[PDB]
């Protein structure tokens, strides 16, 4: 069911039911999560609009003409509309993931049209040709590179859609929303762009300075490249060093699954001792409400007394605290929860846990790591609880965790009455009478229904409260004997006090205990899980552990990274080999992946961001984009090589001619992701995670490739010629 529409219907129904409401009764909606969905959607749409505007400005800064800038820009809305049609046909829905995919693709989907228009303008300016002849020549020159780039960038995202688990579902949204949009952009670039260039382009201050500076920079780049090509082995050694650093950073950097986001509300759970009553829990709940009173950042507070998410009873309570709007708020939800926990720890008779909402709606009820400690050797419940206590002792003294606790009802006292059947027989008492008087002593019996104001209502018979509060009242119960005198239960039943669990839990058909924990700041989810595993390894034999909820999905996501990256790289390599009919040309183009992963890792380290799913998606995107920037030079260099020019001359000429398209394309993508990088407000964490890695990787690939891919080409082709 759709959350937004269901909430709208509920709010409408409540509106109709308001009219027929007795005076003195008021409806309220203290807790509601539906609005945040639309807020996030509108935020992502605004980010998309900002990215579009920035990309248009970047294109204008280079082309210098409004018509030239419009010709590529028109392709993005049409490609996005086609992508929307494909999503509707395939069953996909509009959500933050698909919209983020569109935001990422907005820079890519203008690359082909940018390449077409740049070549058309260059031909018109240099050769003094008419728009229609210039377009014809440009397309004849650039048909193949566009197809190659499109195929590579469509194939690169395919493998991650075949992943298992929730991470596979996450990757699927980006895969579709990027591949379909890229295909549609390539089709538009090959169909509509030539017609517009031939038809709506007329024959040919800051712009003059930009042009002169760009010619100067092109000359400097040519001279620097000519100097550089002389030194090739040193530049292979440096590339190996960079690859090693990239591998070390990728392997030894903390990993996570999903950034934690502020949704404007947090949760609180109160667990009190087994012997606690409703009044005792109400006392601590009143202290929590008083502490949260007068705080400007709280809109409404609701407490459910007697119910919980990990067991219900008289000693449990749950409260939902809603915060004010982000603009009106002054403190983050995490700080609110930390302050609540600090306040409650000092003065309370039970355990109060303030937590933030989970990363995913149905994947748990809290943000953190969840563990299931299992008794796998039939050790026994008390042994499992002793192991739990020792694990808590180890975990409470560690700096890798903030707070680790148990999400279950505490162990408690039990009273058992042993019946002396021999005494019952001797006194003449009948066992069934004892059985009946004990069973009904302190229980509610539903009997029949009776009409109350037109509704059937229950008749419940129970013993009065004053006679079921202490064991003495039960032991005072009397039964009739054969001789005639009444005999109290105390004469015939012996009470026994024991310490036993009040809740029984099982995971995968074994005795189990649920544990929750919050990693400390500067510690990621993966680090906390590894440390918890190490601590568990020290527990007595016969005790095992399982990862459930978010933890299992995170482990599965981390397990599949290497295979996915390798398969994507192999697919791109095979596509390039098919397109260019060589095993060495793809090899040169495959050496830029380290150049981008260097820079992606650097950006995430500089900003202190973890390796998460969005980082992996950015890595795949950077693989595709670096393959594009290598192809843009390598294709033309090879073609000039068959024309008759030498390897070095052809490569240098190709780099000199293709500098401008590469810089334009790379800068368009880079500026298209700044809004994600510098996003502020609500949902900013996800935008930062999705944007920082791609930003760094694109910068590194653009700056480093222009000097490395020519050397890769020359070195590989020379080695191939030498060996064979």
């Amino acid at each position: 069911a759709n959350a937004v529409k269901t909430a709208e219907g509920v709010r409408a129904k409540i509106e109709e039911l308001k009219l027929n409401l007795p005076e003195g009764m008021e409806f309220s909606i203290p807790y509601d999560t539906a609005p945040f969905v639309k807020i996030s959607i509108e935020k992502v749409i605004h980010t998309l609009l900002e990215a579009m505007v920035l990309v248009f400005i970047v294109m204008y800064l280079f082309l210098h003409n409004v018509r030239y800038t419009l010709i590529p820009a028109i392709v993005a809305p049409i490609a996005l509309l086609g992508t929307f049609t494909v999503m509707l046909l395939a069953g996909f829905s509009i959500n933050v993931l698909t919209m983020f995919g569109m935001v990422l693709a907005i820079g890519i989907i203008v690359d082909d049209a940018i390449v077409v228009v740049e070549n058309v303008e260059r031909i018109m300016a240099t050769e003094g040709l008419s728009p229609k002849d210039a377009t014809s020549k440009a397309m004849k020159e650039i048909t193949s590179p566009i197809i190659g780039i499109t195929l590579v960038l469509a194939a690169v995202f395919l493998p991650m859609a075949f992943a298992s688990g929730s991470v596979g579902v996450i990757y699927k949204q980006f895969t579709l929303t990027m591949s379909v949009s890229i295909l549609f952009s390539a089709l538009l670039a090959l169909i509509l762009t030539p017609a517009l260039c031939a038809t709506i382009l007329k024959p040919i201050g800051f712009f003059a300075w930009f042009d002169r500076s760009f010619d100067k920079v092109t000359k400097k780049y040519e001279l620097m490249l000519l100097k550089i090509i002389k030194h090739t082995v040193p530049m292979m050694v440096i590339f190996l060093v960079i690859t090693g650093i990239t591998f070390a950073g990728m392997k030894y950097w903390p990993t996570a699954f999903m950034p934690e986001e502020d949704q404007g509300w947090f949760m609180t759970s109160f667990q009190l001792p087994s012997d606690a009553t409703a009044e005792r829990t109400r006392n601590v709940v009143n202290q929590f409400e008083n502490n949260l009173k007068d705080n400007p950042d709280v809109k409404s507070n609701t407490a459910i007394l007697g119910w919980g998410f990990s067991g219900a009873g008289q000693n449990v309570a749950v409260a939902f605290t809603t915060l004010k709007d982000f603009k009106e708020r002054t403190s983050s939800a995490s700080k609110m929860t930390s302050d609540v926990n600090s306040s409650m720890a000092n003065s309370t008779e039970g355990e109060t846990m303030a937590v933030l909402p989970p990363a995913i709606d149905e994947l748990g009820t809290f943000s953190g790591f969840s563990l299931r400690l299992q008794d796998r050797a039939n050790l026994g419940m008390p042994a499992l609880l002793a192991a739990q206590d020792e694990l808590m002792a180890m975990a409470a003294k560690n700096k890798k965790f903030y707070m680790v606790w148990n999400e279950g009802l505490p162990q408690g006292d039990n009273i058992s009455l042993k019946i002396d059947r021999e005494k019952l027989s001797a006194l003449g008492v009948k066992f069934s009478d004892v059985s009946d008087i004990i069973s009904t002593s302190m229980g509610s019996m539903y009997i029949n229904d009776f009409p109350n104001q037109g509704r059937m209502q229950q008749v419940i018979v129970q013993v009065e409260a004053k006679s079921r509060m202490q064991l003495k009242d039960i032991l005072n119960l009397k039964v009739m004997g054969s001789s005639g005198q009444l005999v109290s239960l105390s004469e015939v039943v012996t009470p026994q006090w024991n310490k036993a669990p009040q809740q029984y839990n099982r995971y995968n058909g074994r005795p189990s205990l649920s544990i929750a924990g919050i990693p400390n700041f500067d510690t990621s989810s993966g680090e906390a899980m590894r440390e918890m595993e190490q601590l568990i390894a020290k527990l007595p034999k016969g005790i095992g552990y399982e990862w459930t909820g978010i933890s299992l999905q995170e482990k599965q996501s981390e397990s599949q990274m290497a295979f996915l990256l390798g398969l994507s790289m192999l697919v791109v390599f095979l596509v390039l080999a098919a397109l260019y009919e060589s095993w060495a040309i793809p090899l040169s183009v495959m050496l830029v992946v380290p150049l981008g992963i260097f820079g992606a890792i650097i950006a995430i380290m500089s900003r202190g961001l973890m390796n998460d799913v969005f980082f992996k998606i950015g890595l795949i995107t950077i693989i595709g984009l670096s393959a594009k920037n290598a192809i843009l030079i390598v294709e033309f260099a090879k073609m000039l090589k068959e024309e008759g020019m030498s390897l070095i001359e052809a490569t240098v000429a190709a780099a000199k001619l293709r500098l401008r398209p590469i810089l334009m394309t790379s800068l368009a993508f880079t500026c298209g992701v700044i809004p994600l990088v510098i996003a502020t407000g609500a949902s900013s964490e996800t935008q930062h995670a999705l944007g920082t890695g791609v930003f760094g990787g694109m910068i590194s690939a653009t700056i480093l490739a222009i000097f490395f891919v020519p050397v890769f080409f020359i070195f590989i082709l020379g080695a191939v010629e030498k060996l064979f």
């Binding site: 008289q314 009273i415 058992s416 009455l417 027989s425 066992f431 509060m469 064991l471």
Partner: protein
């Protein structure tokens, strides 16, 4: 198969009432025929130290679930007899004391019973109540001696007699229809069905 089984169960539910009482109490077992048979696992006693019921009990308690959690193992069908508390009543001894089968059944249903546990301090609670504690009682019989010590009242003389006097109580099989022999000795078996895919 699932959609046939659910339809069949739903249609059976209509006539569940008109069926004989004992059939209802036993229950109607609905299953879907499976063809993913993989192997058979059995246990045998060369020295006859154990019987078929004991072997089946051991297999179900300590073997079947172990095999079920092996990768690729789906359903496990144990063939054998489940243990039960069997009372064999001698009519001559019963008539000696002027007792009948119905009296023995009533005594068993009376002495062996479940007592509902409760909570002291449960809501609604008297003001000032601080301690709430569960309280339970045991009425069921879990040992052979306890069943043998059940007390009946003799009508002929009014004296108190024990169930063991008029009957022999033991631990046997719920049903004795089938027997399994491994090379002419008591044995039990369980068929392992391969999981799909």
């Amino acid at each position: 198969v699932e959609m046939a089984q659910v339809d069949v169960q739903n249609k059976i539910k209509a006539v569940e009432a008109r069926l004989p009482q004992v059939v209802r109490q036993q229950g109607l077992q609905v299953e879907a025929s499976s063809s993913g048979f993989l192997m058979l696992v059995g246990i045998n006693s060369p020295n006859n130290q154990y019987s078929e019921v004991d072997l089946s009990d051991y297999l179900v308690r300590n073997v079947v679930e172990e095999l079920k959690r092996v990768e690729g193992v789906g359903k496990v069908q144990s063939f054998g007899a489940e243990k039960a508390m069997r009372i064999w009543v001698d009519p001559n001894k019963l008539v000696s004391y002027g007792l009948s089968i119905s009296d023995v059944n009533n005594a068993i249903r009376e002495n062996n019973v479940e007592i509902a546990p409760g909570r002291l301090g449960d809501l609604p609670a008297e003001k000032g109540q601080l301690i709430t504690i569960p309280l339970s009682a045991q009425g069921q019989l879990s040992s052979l001696e306890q069943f043998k010590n059940i007390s009946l009242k003799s009508k002929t003389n009014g004296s108190v007699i024990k169930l063991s006097d008029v009957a022999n109580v033991e631990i046997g099989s719920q049903a004795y229809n089938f027997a399994i022999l491994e090379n002419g000795k008591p044995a039990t078996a369980a068929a392992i069905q391969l999981s799909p895919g």
